[PDB]
Amino acid sequence: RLHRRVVITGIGLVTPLGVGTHLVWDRLIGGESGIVSLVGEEYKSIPCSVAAYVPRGSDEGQFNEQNFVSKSDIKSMSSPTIMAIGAAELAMKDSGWHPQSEADQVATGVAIGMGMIPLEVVSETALNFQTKGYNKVSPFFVPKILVNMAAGQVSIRYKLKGPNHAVSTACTTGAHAVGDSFRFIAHGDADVMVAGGTDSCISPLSLAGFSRARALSTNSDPKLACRPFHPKRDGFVMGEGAAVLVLEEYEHAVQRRARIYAEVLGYGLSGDAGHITAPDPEGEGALRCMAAALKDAGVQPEEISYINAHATSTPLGDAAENKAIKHLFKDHAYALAVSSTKGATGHLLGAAGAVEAAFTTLACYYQKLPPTLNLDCSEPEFDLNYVPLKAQEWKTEKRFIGLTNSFGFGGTNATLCIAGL
Amino acid sequence: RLHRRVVITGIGLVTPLGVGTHLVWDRLIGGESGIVSLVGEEYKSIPCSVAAYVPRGSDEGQFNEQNFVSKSDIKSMSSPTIMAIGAAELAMKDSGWHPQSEADQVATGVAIGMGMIPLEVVSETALNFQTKGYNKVSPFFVPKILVNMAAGQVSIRYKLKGPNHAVSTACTTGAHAVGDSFRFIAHGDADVMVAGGTDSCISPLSLAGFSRARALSTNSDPKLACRPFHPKRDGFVMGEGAAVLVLEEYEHAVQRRARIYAEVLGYGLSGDAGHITAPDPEGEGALRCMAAALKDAGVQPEEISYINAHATSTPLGDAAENKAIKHLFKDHAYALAVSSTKGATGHLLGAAGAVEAAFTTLACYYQKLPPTLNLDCSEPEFDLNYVPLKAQEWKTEKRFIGLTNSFGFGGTNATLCIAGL
Amino acid sequence: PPLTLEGIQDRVLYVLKLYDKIDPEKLSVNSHFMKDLGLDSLDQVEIIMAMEDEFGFEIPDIDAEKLMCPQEIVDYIADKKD
Numbered sequence: 001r002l003h004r005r006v007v008i009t010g011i012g013l014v015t016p017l018g019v020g021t022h023l024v025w026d027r028l029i030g031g032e033s034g035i036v037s038l039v040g041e042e043y044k045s046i047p048c049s050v051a052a053y054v055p056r057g058s059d060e061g062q063f064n065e066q067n068f069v070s071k072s073d074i075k076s077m078s079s080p081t082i083m084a085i086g087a088a089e090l091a092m093k094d095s096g097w098h099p100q101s102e103a104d105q106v107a108t109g110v111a112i113g114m115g116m117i118p119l120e121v122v123s124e125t126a127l128n129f130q131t132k133g134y135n136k137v138s139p140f141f142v143p144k145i146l147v148n149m150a151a152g153q154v155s156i157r158y159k160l161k162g163p164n165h166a167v168s169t170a171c172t173t174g175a176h177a178v179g180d181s182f183r184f185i186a187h188g189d190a191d192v193m194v195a196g197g198t199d200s201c202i203s204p205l206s207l208a209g210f211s212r213a214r215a216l217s218t219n220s221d222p223k224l225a226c227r228p229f230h231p232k233r234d235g236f237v238m239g240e241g242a243a244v245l246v247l248e249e250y251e252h253a254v255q256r257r258a259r260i261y262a263e264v265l266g267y268g269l270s271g272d273a274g275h276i277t278a279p280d281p282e283g284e285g286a287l288r289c290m291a292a293a294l295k296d297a298g299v300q301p302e303e304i305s306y307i308n309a310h311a312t313s314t315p316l317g318d319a320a321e322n323k324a325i326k327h328l329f330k331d332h333a334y335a336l337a338v339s340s341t342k343g344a345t346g347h348l349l350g351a352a353g354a355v356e357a358a359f360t361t362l363a364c365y366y367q368k369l370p371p372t373l374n375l376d377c378s379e380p381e382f383d384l385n386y387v388p389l390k391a392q393e394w395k396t397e398k399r400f401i402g403l404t405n406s407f408g409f410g411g412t413n414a415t416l417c418i419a420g421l
Numbered sequence: 422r423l424h425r426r427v428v429i430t431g432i433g434l435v436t437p438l439g440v441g442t443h444l445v446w447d448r449l450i451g452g453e454s455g456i457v458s459l460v461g462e463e464y465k466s467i468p469c470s471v472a473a474y475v476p477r478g479s480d481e482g483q484f485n486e487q488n489f490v491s492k493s494d495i496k497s498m499s500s501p502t503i504m505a506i507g508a509a510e511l512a513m514k515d516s517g518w519h520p521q522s523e524a525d526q527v528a529t530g531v532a533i534g535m536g537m538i539p540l541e542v543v544s545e546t547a548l549n550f551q552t553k554g555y556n557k558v559s560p561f562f563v564p565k566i567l568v569n570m571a572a573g574q575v576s577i578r579y580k581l582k583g584p585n586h587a588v589s590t591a592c593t594t595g596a597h598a599v600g601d602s603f604r605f606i607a608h609g610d611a612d613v614m615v616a617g618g619t620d621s622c623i624s625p626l627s628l629a630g631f632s633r634a635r636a637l638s639t640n641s642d643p644k645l646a647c648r649p650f651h652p653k654r655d656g657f658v659m660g661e662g663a664a665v666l667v668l669e670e671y672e673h674a675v676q677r678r679a680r681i682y683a684e685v686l687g688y689g690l691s692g693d694a695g696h697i698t699a700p701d702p703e704g705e706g707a708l709r710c711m712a713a714a715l716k717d718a719g720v721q722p723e724e725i726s727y728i729n730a731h732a733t734s735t736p737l738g739d740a741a742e743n744k745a746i747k748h749l750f751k752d753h754a755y756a757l758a759v760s761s762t763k764g765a766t767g768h769l770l771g772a773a774g775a776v777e778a779a780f781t782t783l784a785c786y787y788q789k790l791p792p793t794l795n796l797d798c799s800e801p802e803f804d805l806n807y808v809p810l811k812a813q814e815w816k817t818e819k820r821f822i823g824l825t826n827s828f829g830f831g832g833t834n835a836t837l838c839i840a841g842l
Numbered sequence: 843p844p845l846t847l848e849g850i851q852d853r854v855l856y857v858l859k860l861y862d863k864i865d866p867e868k869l870s871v872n873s874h875f876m877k878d879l880g881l882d883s884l885d886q887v888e889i890i891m892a893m894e895d896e897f898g899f900e901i902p903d904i905d906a907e908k909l910m911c912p913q914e915i916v917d918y919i920a921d922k923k924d
């Protein structure tokens with residue numbers, strides 16, 4: 001029929017590295033990390049002792065709830081929702097898109113997911129209902145556990161009357177939010193989509209849950225705990241944050257004189273169908289969804305020059321992704337660069353895929369590759385360029401085209417193909 | 422073949438009417454309901470006193486977990502996950518699609534969402550962590566609260582390695598699952614999608630939460646509590662269940678000699694962007710969503726003959742939907758039929774949109790319209806054909822086309838346009 | 843003597859003026875919660891919870907759905923006395 005092009009015109013970041021597009025990128029390229037030690041009596045008795053938190057306060061690059069939401073709102077809604085509203089405000093300001101006309105409002109949709117509901121609000125409400133009874137239960141209880149409350153709030157505040165699409169896919173939420181938004185715009189359903197992910201579920205109970213599943217690094221030292229592709233990797237580090245991207249049809253962006261970061265070319269999805277937690281040891285699943293994204297984009301493996309890997313510092317996970325890259329890209333695997341930013345931000349769960357879409361986008365825009373931190377050495381199976389320790393300039397003899405991967409529990413895989421103009 | 426045709430070849434139902442395609446449909450057409458009185462010591466404190474449960478047992482049309490999942494799996498998986506696996510098994514059996522070749526496995530994806538996590542598992546694990554310590558948390562805890570675990574298990578069990586997509590949109594999950602699956606197949610990403618929704622969150626804590634939000638009937642009589650479009654409608658009744666549809670590209674289905682129920686023509690989405698609680702009293706959002714679905718399908722309003730309304734027996738909700746129908750269809754509003762099946766099944770939350778897709782699909786296959794129950798009395802504002810009390814035949818000589826609507830909290834609207842072949 | 847009505851009215855107003863979402867200078871005794879003050883149902887539920895604490899009794903949901911203005915809260919509150 002037709003195919004319209006889709007570009008990214010706004011980025012909003014609330015991360016363990018801080019808040020704001022320029023600032024977060026500068027820290028990322030500079031080799032900074034937000035991974036810190038857990039402190040508190042409620043976290044004793046848990047094997048894990050590190051996490052990555054959004055820095056809060058009033059200095060520049062700190063998250064201040066009050067700059068984004070009113071005092072009434074702060075009590076009414078969850079921490080993830082507030083971060084998503086924050087990231088969205090920043091993203092739309094970065095985009096310069098303020099729909100006033102009805103036609104512009106119906107052209108603009110939202111796709112902001114949440115990976116997981118915060119277990120603490122459930123437990124506190126539950127105990128309050130047992131102790132004190134029905135009449136003491138907050139009416140905001142159910143709103144605070146619904147995944148699409150973020151999208152709802154953004155939609156109301158910015159008058160976004162186009163496609164509304166919350167999704168919750170645990171660790172792939174952010175990727176699906178961006179990919180689906182791309183598809184909606186490409187198909188003609190909207191001209192603009194505000195897309196991303198949020199997660200803030202660092203709590204004794206959730207860390208307990210992940211620790212018990214053998215998922216988390218037990219290393220006590222925040223400087224070393226998260227080490228993608230490294231020999232001593234022993235589990236991921238839980239992080240929190242939100243990232244929002246404004247996607248937009250190409251001609252719409254150009255005509256309104258927007259600053260364009262990059263173009264979204266493709267989206268792919270696959271299932272492992274091996275096992276629940278275990279990734280496909282050969283990376284069959286990862287290979288298929290990367291290939292699906294390349295087919296969607298009409299691009300050959302040899303044109304890819306960077307990959308933001310999902311690698312979360314797990315033994316089997318990092319090895320699977322690495323295998324898939326080598327099988328898909330063949331000889332050209334040695335010509336490309338691969339980096340995981342999880343050493344810097346930790347694993348942002350639902351937001352992981354949206355933040356890494358942002359980073360892949362900025363990589364294209366600045367032709368600069370963020371480091372994989374803590375990668376002081378490497379085993380023979382890991383013999384590619386993982387951009388160890390320091391940033392590298394991205395140099396290629398044609399267009400700058402990257403992939404960003406997101407793999408989730410249950411063997412759901414997603415890949416986005418992002419390119420410089 | 423950039424935009425193919427998409428058909429439905431399989432339906433799997435686990436509802437409060439019972440289990441199995443023929444059986445559930447017959448009882449629906451016959452005016453049966455699964456709404457019953459709450460029978461628990463722990464329900465007395467809450468002003469709701471009715472719900473709709475899936476009947477359990479080994480008689481015909483009763484749900485028997487054992488026929489779908491092993492005795493070990495029952496312990497490690499939530500109630501909604503088990504229902505989704507059951508509905509999926511039934512749906513694929515009903516389809517005759519059991520992919521064994523690699524080509525067929527990669528061409529088959531899953532899109533099964535869960536609208537709400539079961540609060541009870543969170544509260545019991547939380548209390549166990551507080552009073553018994555870290556070593557008493559199950560390692561199956563986190564898997565049991567993730568929204569994509571249903572899709573995960575289906576994918577593994579039936580070897581489905583195409584697009585994997587769990588969506589959690591609360592009350593609109595099932596609609597998004599089917600619409601997105603349609604888009605994926607039309608776009609070329611998959612030949613077959615196993616798509617639907619599940620929810621089983623009837624518990625003291627969730628009923629308390631919904632009661633507090635003024636959402637639920639306080640009416641004590643299970644026979645009368647849920648009455649869409651009726652003057653004394655006072656809230657929805659919570660149900661549980663799962664529904665799965667096998668969607669399939671037209672040519673693929675024909676070549677394998679599949680029994681085709683109906684064709685999916687279109688999908689639309691919008692957001693109200695007004696208030697998070699109430700629908701827009703004029704239903705401008707519902708109108709835009711329905712119109713977007715009609716545009717996607719390349720059909721004018723005058724070709725629609727049936728509407729499965731979202732009406733959940735809410736004062737402001739049912740009135741808004743009714744207004745939207747009248748403004749969109751104009752004079753043709755009096756020529757069509759509108760029915761809400763929620764009096765029969767209750768509100769199945771995440772599954773509501775998938776079960777109603779199933780019902781609209783069967784309404785296509787036969788030309789039989791399920792009744793709106795309990796509609797003995799009607800206000801002047803509601804002056805359309807709501808198929809009151811008794812089912813109606815609808816033998817148009819022209820092609821039978823239905824819409825099914827799903828409206829959620831946050832003001833998110835979804836519409837599917839489904840047609841007899 | 844248990845209560846005055848000028849006095850249970852001072853408490854309804856006291857409580858409403860404490861509620862962050864109400865703007866004190868729009869809050870009259872007959873202002874509708876949703877039409878004038880711009881609240882929603884969930885907010886109103888919070889208001890009757892605050893009333894439940896202030897007067898130390900339980901208002902059933904059925905009766906709470908009715909109370910759409912401060913005046914109407916006073917009369918329901920007043921039902922216990924004369």
Ligand SMILES: *[C@@H](CCCCC)CC(=O)NCCNC(=O)CCNC(=O)[C@H](O)C(C)(C)COP(*)(=O)O
Nearest residue numbers: 591592634635636698700735738828829830882883
């Ligand atoms: C599904 C998620 C569950 C609800 C969470 C509380 C949402 C769903 O079913 N979508 C909406 C369809 N119904 C409506 O349009 C709701 C109409 N609203 C009502 O009448 C509600 O009962 C109130 C929130 C009480 C209305 O609020 P106040 O009277 O303003």
